[PDB]
Design a protein around this ligand. Structure first.
Ligand SMILES: CCCCCCCCCCCCCCCCCC(=O)OC[C@H](COP(=O)([O-])OCC(O)COP(=O)([O-])OC[C@@H](COC(=O)CCCCCCCCCCCCCCCCC)OC(=O)CCCCCCCCCCCCCCCCC)OC(=O)CCCCCCCCCCCCCCCCC
Ligand code: SF4
Ligand code: SF4
Ligand code: SF4
Ligand code: SF4
Ligand code: FES
Ligand SMILES: [K+]
Ligand SMILES: [Zn+2]
Lengths: 263, 115, 129, 176, 96, 115, 95, 211, 53, 209
C-alpha cells in the first residue's frame, strides 16, 4: 500500500505516512518522554523533552511533531539524545519550587519520574528561583501556578475538548504565566479533567486535596452511574474508604475523561 | 622422596608412599574406560587429552615435589583422589550416555527473565 | 526421546487440594485478570504491559482502638503478574478459583499532524499556543 | 599466607619429659588459671550503678519517636507520608487534611511502637525533620495499649524531650 | 485552644471528641485522654506578619539546614498575605 | 501435554492401593495416639475424623495428585507416630474454638456481606 | 569503675604480666564527647561542569546476560587457572 | 592482653582440652562435600578463605594470615577462632592506619540519598530523595549469588530482581544450615556432653540457619 | 550480613562504593568478626562450664 | 578514574568463563539447554531436569571442572511460566576457584530427581524446597517437612500464598491449649503501588508482538 519502512535504533517497522516520530517509536515499545503532547490533544512541540537524534542528522528533532520519512533510523538511546533530554529537563527543573513533600502530585508527578529515568542527580542552579502568584479558578481545582511548566496542555484542553476558551497564557519570557488574567470562573462540565492533564501539581483536586499520597490507594475498576453514559472509572480507595474517582481509558465510552459531576 | 611427608595437611586423606605407580595405574585405567567411550563424543577427546598429558608429565618427572608443582593439584594425595573421582565419573556416565542430542527443548519461554 | 514412563492424562490439573487453600477461599472467592489501566495523572505507559490477577474485596471494618483497617480475608492484598492472559487463566483454573476475563484494552493509534494546528478552511485550526 | 595453628609437637629429652610429667601430676596450668582468676578477683569491678548512673550514649542514639515543632510552635510535619512509605515494619499511619488555617497537618499520626523496630529510617526520610527518635529509652510500659502511641502522645513526647532533641540535632545535623 | 466536651472531655487540635453515648469512653475512666495543649493552629496565628520589602521572598523556616526546604513565596497579591506552606509564617509587602 | 510423569502410582488402582494401607496405619494408630498423647478425643470419634478427612478429597482424579496426598499423609503419619507432633496440633483437626459457621443464605445475609 | 601498690603487685604476679600498661577499664584517655562541628567533604562528581549523568550512570550501563550457547581442535579449558599454594606465615609459621 | 588471657585459661588447660581435643573429627574431603564453610573448613585443613581468594571490597590490600587447622577436631577449630581474633586485631590496625579522605556514599544520587544540605536547597536532590524513599532505586533485572566470609562462615545471598523498585526473590545461604545438616555425621558415637561441646565450635546461632 | 546484602545490591547496579566506604565497611566487618568470635568462644566455654571467660 | 562510581569491568574472567561454558555445553549436550554468562561475570547453565544427577556429577567429579561445594540450593517460584518452579544449584570450585550456577525447571507435580548423592549438603536444602515450594524430590532419603510449623499446609514461598498466611494460633482457656484460628488481622497490610509507570532500563526492554 503506502506503508513506509522506518528504522528505530536498528529494527525497522511499517509506518503510515504522516505519522509522527514518537508514534513510530511507540510502535516498537520504547516511549519518548514528553510533557507537551497528549495523544487526544493537539501538538505544540513545547516541552522540548520530545527531542531525539535522527541518524546522520546534525540537530535533534522533536518527536512530538515530526513527520517521519524514508529510512530514518530513530536513535532513541543515542548519547546526543540523552544529553538533549538532560539539558531540557535541567531547564524545566530549575524554577520548579521545592514542594514535592507538600505537592499532591508527589509520587506520580511525571516530572519526578522523568527525573528518575532521564535526568541529572544534582542541581547547578546557583541563583534564586521564580515565584508566580496563585490564580483561583474554582473550588474544584487547586491552583499552585509556581509549579507550572507551561506545557500548555490545560489551554489546549480548554480550547478543543471543553470548548470554553478562557484558559490561556499571559506575558512573555520567564514571567509568562498561564491562567485566566481576569479572575474568571472556569465552570465547564469537563473542568475536573484538567487535574489529570496537568503533568505537575500545578492543578489538583480541591475536594481530595492532600487526603492520601497516591502510592497507598488501591485502585479498583468500576463504572460511573451518575450518567447513562456509564463512563469507565477507577475508584482509588485506601484503608476501606473512597478517596477519589479517576477516568479509565475506553476509547468507545469516555476516552480518558469524565464529567466533574462523575469525578 | 627422601623423608616421606608426615601429613598432607588435610585430615580426610593420608600419604601415599608410592604415588608414581598409583598415578600410572589410575591413568591407564581411565584411558581404558575412555577407549570404551565412542570416538565422536567430545568427552573422550577432552579427557583423553588431559589424562595423556598428565601421564606424560608424571612418567617424565620422577620427583614428587616437582610432580605437585607441574601437576598444579596440590599434594599428590588429593591428585590421586581426583584421579579416582575422574575414573568414577567416566564409569558412571558410560551408561548415562550424554553424547546424544538434547532430550527436548524447554517449553516455549521458560528462560526469559523479564517477567 | 524423553522416556520417563509417560501417561496420557486428559483431565485438567486439580492441584487445589495440594495448595492448602481453605474450602471457602477456593470456592467463594472470585478472581479477575486484567491489564491495569495507567494512572491518568501520569503519561507513563509501562504499567499496562502485564496481566495482573486480583480478588474480590471483602469486609474492611474499623478496630475499636484507632479505627484501623483490620480485615479477615488474607487474599485481599494479593495480586499476581503474568506475561500473557493464557498463563493467568491456566493458573486460575488449575488452582480452582472462579475467574473473570477482561480483554487487554489498548489505545487506538490516531493520526496526528502539527499541520492540523493551522488551516485555511478546516475547523481544526487552533486559537492559541 | 597462612599459619599452622597446632603442629608444635613436643621433644622427648629427659628435661622435657620430666617437665610434662610434673605438669600432668603436679597440676600447673590448672594453677595458672586458678591464679589468673585470682588476679581478676583483686581488680576493679566493672559495674555501673543503675539507675543512679547510666551507660554512655551517642548523639545519634535511636529511641522513642517524637514529633518536633518549629520555633514558632507550629508542628513541622506537613504530612508528606514519606515516613509511612519508608517504615519497613509499617508501624506508621497518617491521615492528612486541609486544616482550618490550611497547612496540611495530620488528622491522625500514630506509630505502633510494638511494630516499630527502631531503625531511624523515618527521621532520615523526613524532609522537615518533623519525626525524630529521642534519646529516651526509659519507657517500658505495663499494658500493650500503653505502647501503641497516638498523635497527641507523640506531640507530648516532642514537647517533653525537646531540649534534648534540639541539642542532639545541633550536634549531629552536619554528619547527616 | 483546648475546649471541654459536653461530656467533659478535652477536645483535640483535630477536633476529635467522643460523643454522649460513644461506648468507647471506658478507656478514659481511671485514666486520662492525653491531649496536647500547644495547639499548632493558634501558635502560628499570633506570629507577626513579616514586612520584608521585595517581590519574591525566600523562606527556609529558620535554622538554615535545620529548617524546611527553601521555598520562594510570592508577595504579589495585595489583598492577602503570602505564607510558606511548610512553616506558616505570613509574609507581606510593607504596604507596598 | 496429556502425557505426564508419575510419582509412584501408574493408574488409579495402585494409588487406590496406597490410600488403603494409609488408612490401615491411621486405623491402627488412632487408639494408641489417644492413649499416648492423652487426647480428649474418643476412639470412635478419632476414627471418623480420619474417615472424613479421607472423604474430604473425594473429587481428586489425577494420579500424581493422589501420590501427593498419600505422601503428605505419610509425612503426617511420621509426625504423629514418633511424637514429633504435639497434642495441640493433633487437636487442630478438630475445630473446637472455631465457632459454628452458618450455611443458609438467610443467615449469611443476617451476619454480614459475604458469599 | 587505681588500686593499692600492695594489691597492684599481687594481681600482676598472679596474672604474670604488667597489666597497668592497659586495663579493661577506660580512664580519661577516651575521646571527648563534644567534638567540633566536622566539615564533611564531597564526592568526585561534585563539579558543576562535565557532570553529565549519561557518562556516569552505572545501572543504565548494564547489558543483558550474554548468551553463549543456546538450544536453538579446541583443547580442554578450566573454569579458572589452578589456584596457587599460599605461603607459610613469615611472622609465626606455627603457633 | 585479654585475648591471650582467655587463651591461657582455655588453651593449655587439661580439662578444656580433654573435653574438646579430638572429639568429633571431620574429614577434610567429607567436609567440603557436606557444604561446610568458614572455620569448619579451616579447622579441618583446607586452605580456603573468601577474604583472600575472592577479596570483596578492600580486603585484598589488607595483609593477614589465616589460621589453618591440623587435626580437624573441636580444639583445632577453637584455636583457629582465637588466632582469627588476633589476625582480626592486626587487620584492624592496618585499616585504622590507612583510611583515605572521601565521601561516605556513592556520589550518584539516584541510588544513594542526597546530603541534607542539597535536599533543602536543590530541586534535583529533593526529587531524588522523595522518589528514593518513596519508590527506591529500581534494580536492573538479574540474578546474583553474592558470598562473603562472615565470621560464622561463608554467608551468601541469592538475590534475583525482576527489574522494578522491589526484589523478586532473596534467598539466604547461612553458614549454619549446612553445618546442622552435617551435624549428624559430625557426632557419631561421642557422648551427650560431646554433642554439646560440638554445637559450640559448630557456633550455630539459631537466627540465620532457621531464617 | 549488611555487607553481604549491600554488596549484592550494588553489584546488581554496576556501582562501586567510594574508597572510604570500603575502608569503613572492612573495619566494621572486622569489629563484627571480633564480636562474633567472642560470642562463639565464650558461650562455648559457658556450655562446657567455664563462666569467667 | 573517569568512572569512579561504575563498578569495574573484568572482561578476562568473562571470556574465560564463556570458554568453560562452551566446554560444558559440548561435554553434555543431552541435558544442557542454554548456557550464558552475566555481565558481572557469573555463568548460568540451563539444563533439562533429567540432568540433575548427571550434570552435577560431571561438575563434581571432572578433573577440568572440579566443583565440590554446594553453596546453596534454591527454588524461585514464578507462576507465569508453564513449569512455574525453577531450581538453582550454586557450585563453587576450589582448585579453579569460581562460582557456577545450574538451573532446572519443574511444575508442582512433575518430580525432579534429588541430588543428595552428588552433594550430601543438598539434603537439608532439598527438604526446604519441598517444605517451601511443593517441589517433591524423587527418592530423597527423608523428604519430611523441615522449616514450617507442625501440621502445616501449602508452601509459603509460592507467590499465590498470602503474606499473612491463613491461620494463626493463640491460647484458649475454653480448651486449655493453644488453638489454630482463621486469620483475622488487627491492621491489614497496606500494599503500596510502587514501580513508576516510566521505563527504567532501555537495554532490557521486552520485544513487542
Ligand atoms: C585480710 C584483710 C585485712 C583487712 C582489710 C584490708 C584491706 O583490704 O584494706 C583495703 C586495702 C586497699 O584495697 P584495694 O582493693 O587495693 O583498694 C583500691 C582502692 O584504693 C579502693 O578505694 P575506695 O575509695 O573504694 O576505698 C575505700 C574502701 C576501702 O576498704 C577499706 O577501707 C576496708 C577496711 C575497713 C574500712 O572502704 C570503703 O569503701 C568503706 C566501706 C568498707 C566496707 C566494709 C569493710 C570491712 C572490712 C573488714 C572489717 C572487719 C571484719 O588493702 C590493702 O591495701 C592491702 C591490705 C592487706 C592486708 C592483709 C592482712 C593479712
Ligand atoms: S508537581 Fe512540583 S512540587 Fe509536586 S511533586 Fe512534582 S516537582 Fe514536586
Ligand atoms: S497549569 Fe498545568 S496544564 Fe497548564 S500549562 Fe501549566 S503545567 Fe501545563
Ligand atoms: S524506627 Fe521509626 S520509621 Fe523505622 S520502623 Fe520504627 S517507627 Fe517506623
Ligand atoms: S516524613 Fe516527616 S513530614 Fe512527612 S509525614 Fe512523616 S513526619 Fe510528617
Ligand atoms: S512532545 Fe516534544 S515538546 Fe511536547
Ligand atoms: K496534575
Ligand atoms: Zn517557611
Amino acid at each position: 500500500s503506502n506503508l513506509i519502512e522506518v528504522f528505530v535504533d536498528g529494527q525497522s517497522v511499517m509506518v503510515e505516512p504522516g505519522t509522527t516520530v514518537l508514534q513510530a517509536c511507540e510502535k516498537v515499545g520504547m516511549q519518548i518522554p514528553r510533557f507537551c503532547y497528549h495523544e487526544r490533544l493537539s501538538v505544540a512541540g513545547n516541552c522540548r523533552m520530545c527531542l531525539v537524534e535522527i541518524e546522520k542528522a546534525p540537530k535533534v528533532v522533536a518527536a512530538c511533531a515530526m513527520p517521519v520519512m524514508k529510512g530514518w533510523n530513530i536513535l532513541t538511546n543515542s548519547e546526543k539524545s540523552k544529553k538533549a533530554r538532560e539539558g531540557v529537563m535541567e531547564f524545566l527543573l530549575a524554577n520548579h519550587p521545592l514542594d514535592c513533600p507538600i505537592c499532591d502530585q508527589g509520587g506520580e508527578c511525571d516530572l519526578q519520574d522523568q527525573s528518575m529515568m532521564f535526568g541529572s542527580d544534582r542541581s547547578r542552579f546557583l541563583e534564586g528561583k521564580r515565584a508566580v502568584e496563585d490564580k483561583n479558578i474554582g473550588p474544584l481545582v487547586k491552583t499552585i501556578m509556581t509549579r507550572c511548566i507551561q506545557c500548555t496542555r490545560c489551554i489546549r484542553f480548554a480550547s478543543e475538548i471543553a470548548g470554553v476558551d478562557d484558559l490561556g497564557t499571559t506575558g512573555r519570557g520567564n514571567d509568562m504565566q498561564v491562567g485566566t488574567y481576569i479572575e474568571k470562573m472556569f465552570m465547564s462540565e469537563l473542568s475536573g479533567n484538567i487535574i489529570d492533564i496537568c503533568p505537575v501539581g500545578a492543578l489538583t483536586s480541591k475536594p481530595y486535596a492532600f487526603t492520601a499520597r497516591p502510592w497507598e490507594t488501591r485502585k479498583t475498576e468500576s463504572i460511573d452511574v451518575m450518567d447513562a453514559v456509564g463512563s469507565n472509572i477507577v475508584v482509588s480507595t485506601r484503608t476501606g474508604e473512597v478517596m477519589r474517582i479517576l477516568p479509565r481509558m475506553h476509547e468507545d465510552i469516555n476516552e480518558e475523561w469524565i464529567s466533574d459531576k462523575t469525578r | 622422596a627422601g623423608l616421606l611427608k608426615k601429613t598432607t595437611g588435610l585430615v580426610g586423606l593420608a600419604v601415599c608412599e608410592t604415588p608414581h605407580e598409583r598415578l600410572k595405574i589410575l591413568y591407564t585405567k581411565i584411558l581404558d574406560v575412555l577407549g570404551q567411550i565412542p570416538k565422536n563424543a567430545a568427552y573422550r577427546k577432552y579427557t583423553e587429552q588431559i589424562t595423556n598429558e598428565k601421564l606424560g608429565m608424571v612418567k617424565a618427572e620422577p620427583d614428587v615435589k616437582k610432580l605437585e608443582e607441574q601437576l598444579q593439584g596440590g599434594q599428590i594425595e588429593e591428585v590421586i583422589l581426583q584421579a579416582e573421582n575422574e575414573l568414577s565419573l567416566a564409569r558412571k556416565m558410560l551408561r548415562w550416555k550424554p553424547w546424544e542430542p538434547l532430550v527436548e527443548e524447554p517449553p516455549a519461554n521458560q528462560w526469559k527473565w523479564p517477567i | 526421546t524423553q522416556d520417563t514412563q509417560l501417561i496420557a492424562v486428559d483431565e485438567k490439573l486439580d492441584i487445589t487440594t495440594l495448595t492448602g487453600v481453605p474450602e471457602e477461599h477456593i470456592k467463594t472467592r472470585k478472581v479477575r485478570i486484567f491489564v491495569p489501566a495507567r494512572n491518568n495523572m501520569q503519561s507513563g505507559v509501562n504499567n499496562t504491559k502485564k496481566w495482573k490477577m486480583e480478588f474480590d474485596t471483602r469486609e474492611r471494618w474499623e478496630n475499636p482502638l484507632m479505627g484501623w483497617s483490620s480485615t479477615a480475608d488474607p487474599l485481599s492484598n494479593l495480586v499476581l503478574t503474568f506475561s500473557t492472559k493464557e498463563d493467568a487463566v491456566a493458573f486460575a483454573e488449575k488452582n480452582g478459583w472462579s475467574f473473570d476475563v477482561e480483554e487487554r484494552k489498548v489505545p487506538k493509534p490516531k493520526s496526528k499532524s502539527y499541520g492540523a494546528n493551522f488551516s485555511w478552511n478546516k475547523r481544526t485550526r487552533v486559537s492559541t499556543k | 599466607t597462612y599459619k599452622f595453628v597446632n603442629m608444635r609437637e613436643p621433644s622427648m629429652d629427659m628435661k622435657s619429659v620430666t617437665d610434662r610429667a610434673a605438669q600432668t601430676l603436679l597440676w600447673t596450668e590448672l594453677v595458672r588459671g586458678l591464679g589468673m582468676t585470682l588476679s581478676y578477683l583483686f581488680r576493679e569491678p566493672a559495674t555501673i550503678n543503675y539507675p543512679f548512673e547510666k551507660g554512655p550514649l551517642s548523639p545519634r542514639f535511636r529511641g522513642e519517636h517524637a514529633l518536633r515543632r518549629y520555633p514558632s510552635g507550629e508542628e513541622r510535619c506537613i504530612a508528606c507520608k514519606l515516613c509511612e512509605a519508608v517504615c519497613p515494619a509499617q508501624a506508621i499511619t497518617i491521615e492528612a487534611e486541609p486544616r482550618a488555617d490550611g497547612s496540611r497537618r495530620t488528622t491522625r499520626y500514630d506509630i505502633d511502637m510494638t511494630k516499630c523496630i527502631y531503625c531511624g529510617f523515618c527521621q532520615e526520610a523526613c524532609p522537615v525533620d518533623a519525626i525524630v527518635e529521642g534519646p529516651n529509652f526509659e519507657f517500658s510500659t505495663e499494658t500493650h495499649e500503653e505502647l501503641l502511641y497516638n498523635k497527641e502522645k507523640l506531640l507530648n513526647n516532642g514537647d517533653k524531650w525537646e531540649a534534648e532533641i534540639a541539642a542532639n540535632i545541633q550536634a549531629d545535623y552536619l554528619y547527616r | 485552644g483546648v475546649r471541654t466536651s459536653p461530656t467533659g472531655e478535652k477536645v483535640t487540635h483535630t477536633g476529635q471528641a467522643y460523643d454522649d453515648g460513644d461506648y468507647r469512653r471506658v478507656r478514659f475512666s481511671d485514666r486520662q485522654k492525653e491531649v496536647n495543649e500547644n495547639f499548632a493552629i493558634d501558635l502560628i496565628a499570633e506570629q507577626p506578619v513579616s514586612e520584608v520589602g521585595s517581590r519574591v521572598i525566600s523562606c527556609d523556616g529558620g535554622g538554615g539546614a535545620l529548617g524546611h526546604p527553601r521555598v520562594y513565596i510570592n508577595l504579589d497579591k495585595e489583598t492577602k498575605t503570602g505564607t510558606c506552606g511548610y512553616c506558616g509564617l505570613q509574609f507581606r509587602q510593607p504596604h507596598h | 501435554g496429556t502425557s505426564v510423569k508419575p510419582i509412584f502410582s501408574r493408574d488409579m488402582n495402585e494409588a487406590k492401593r496406597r490410600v488403603r494401607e494409609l488408612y490401615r496405619a491411621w486405623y491402627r494408630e488412632v487408639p494408641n495416639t489417644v492413649h499416648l498423647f492423652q487426647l480428649d478425643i474418643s476412639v470412635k470419634q478419632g476414627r471418623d475424623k480420619v474417615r472424613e478427612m479421607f472423604m474430604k478429597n473425594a473429587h481428586v482424579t489425577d494420579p500424581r495428585v493422589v501420590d501427593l496426598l498419600v505422601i503428605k499423609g505419610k509425612m503426617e503419619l511420621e509426625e504423629t507416630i514418633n511424637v514429633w507432633k504435639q497434642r495441640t496440633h493433633i487437636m487442630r483437626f478438630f475445630h473446637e474454638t472455631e465457632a459454628p459457621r452458618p450455611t443458609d443464605f438467610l443467615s449469611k445475609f443476617y451476619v454480614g456481606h459475604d458469599p | 569503675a587505681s588500686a593499692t601498690r600492695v594489691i597492684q603487685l599481687l594481681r600482676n604476679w598472679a596474672s604474670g604480666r604488667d597489666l597497668q600498661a592497659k586495663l579493661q577499664l577506660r580512664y580519661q584517655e577516651i575521646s571527648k564527647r563534644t567534638q567540633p562541628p566536622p566539615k564533611l567533604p564531597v564526592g568526585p562528581s561534585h563539579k558543576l561542569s562535565n557532570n553529565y549523568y549519561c557518562t556516569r550512570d552505572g545501572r543504565r550501563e548494564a547489558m543483558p546476560p550474554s548468551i553463549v550457547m543456546s538450544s536453538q581442535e579446541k583443547k580442554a579449558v578450566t573454569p579458572a587457572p589452578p589456584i596457587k599454594r599460599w605461603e607459610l606465615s613469615k611472622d609465626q609459621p606455627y603457633l | 592482653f585479654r585475648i591471650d588471657e582467655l587463651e591461657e585459661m582455655l588453651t593449655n588447660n587439661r580439662i578444656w582440652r580433654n573435653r574438646t581435643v579430638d572429639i568429633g573429627v571431620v574429614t577434610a574431603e567429607d567436609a567440603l562435600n557436606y557444604g561446610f564453610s568458614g572455620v569448619m573448613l579451616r579447622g579441618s585443613g583446607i586452605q580456603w578463605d573468601l577474604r583472600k581468594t575472592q577479596p570483596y571490597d578492600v580486603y585484598d590490600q589488607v595483609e593477614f594470615d589465616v589460621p589453618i587447622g591440623s587435626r580437624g577436631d573441636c580444639y583445632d577449630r577453637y584455636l583457629c577462632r582465637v588466632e582469627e581474633m588476633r589476625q582480626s586485631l592486626r587487620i584492624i590496625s592496618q585499616c585504622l592506619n590507612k583510611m583515605p579522605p572521601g565521601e561516605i556514599k556513592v556520589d550518584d544520587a539516584k541510588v544513594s540519598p542526597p546530603k541534607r544540605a542539597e535536599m533543602k536547597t536543590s530541586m534535583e536532590s529533593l526529587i531524588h530523595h522523595f522518589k528514593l524513599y518513596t519508590e527506591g532505586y529500581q534494580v536492573p533485572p538479574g540474578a546474583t549469588y553474592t558470598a562473603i566470609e562472615a565470621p560464622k562462615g561463608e554467608f551468601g545471598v541469592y538475590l534475583v530482581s525482576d527489574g522494578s523498585s522491589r526484589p523478586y526473590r532473596c534467598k539466604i545461604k547461612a553458614p549454619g544450615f549446612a553445618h546442622l545438616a552435617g551435624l549428624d555425621k559430625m557426632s557419631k558415637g561421642h557422648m551427650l556432653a560431646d554433642v554439646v561441646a560440638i554445637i559450640g565450635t559448630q557456633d550455630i546461632v539459631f537466627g540465620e540457619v532457621d531464617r | 550480613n549488611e555487607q553481604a546484602y549491600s554488596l549484592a545490591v550494588e553489584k546488581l547496579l554496576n556501582i562501586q562504593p567510594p574508597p572510604r566506604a570500603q575502608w569503613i565497611r572492612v573495619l566494621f566487618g572486622e569489629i563484627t568478626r571480633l564480636l562474633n568470635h567472642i560470642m562463639a568462644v565464650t558461650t562455648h566455654a559457658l556450655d562446657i562450664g567455664a563462666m569467667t571467660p | 578514574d573517569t568512572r569512579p562510581t561504575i563498578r569495574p569491568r573484568n572482561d578476562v574472567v568473562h571470556k574465560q568463563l564463556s570458554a568453560f561454558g562452551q566446554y560444558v555445553a559440548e561435554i553434555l549436550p543431552k541435558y544442557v539447554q542454554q548456557v550464558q554468562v552475566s555481565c558481572f561475570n557469573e555463568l548460568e547453565i540451563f539444563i533439562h531436569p533429567d540432568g540433575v544427577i548427571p550434570v552435577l556429577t560431571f561438575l563434581r567429579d571432572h578433573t577440568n571442572a572440579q566443583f565440590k561445594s554446594l553453596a546453596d540450593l534454591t527454588a524461585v517460584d514464578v507462576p507465569t511460566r508453564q513449569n512455574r518452579f525453577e531450581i538453582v544449584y550454586n557450585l563453587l570450585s576450589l582448585r579453579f576457584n569460581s562460582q557456577i550456577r545450574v538451573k532446572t525447571y519443574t511444575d508442582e507435580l512433575t518430580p525432579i530427581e534429588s541430588s543428595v548423592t552428588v552433594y550430601k549438603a543438598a539434603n537439608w536444602y532439598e527438604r526446604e524446597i519441598w517444605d517451601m515450594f511443593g517441589v517433591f524430590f524423587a527418592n530423597h532419603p527423608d523428604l519430611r517437612r523441615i522449616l514450617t510449623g507442625y501440621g502445616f499446609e501449602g508452601h509459603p514461598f509460592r507467590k499465590d500464598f498470602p503474606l499473612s498466611g491463613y491461620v494463626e494460633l493463640r491460647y484458649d482457656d475454653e480448651v486449655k491449649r493453644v488453638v489454630a484460628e482463621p486469620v483475622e488481622l488487627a491492621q491489614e497490610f497496606r500494599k503500596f503501588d510502587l514501580n513508576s509507570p516510566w521505563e527504567a532500563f532501555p537495554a532490557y526492554r521486552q520485544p513487542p508482538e
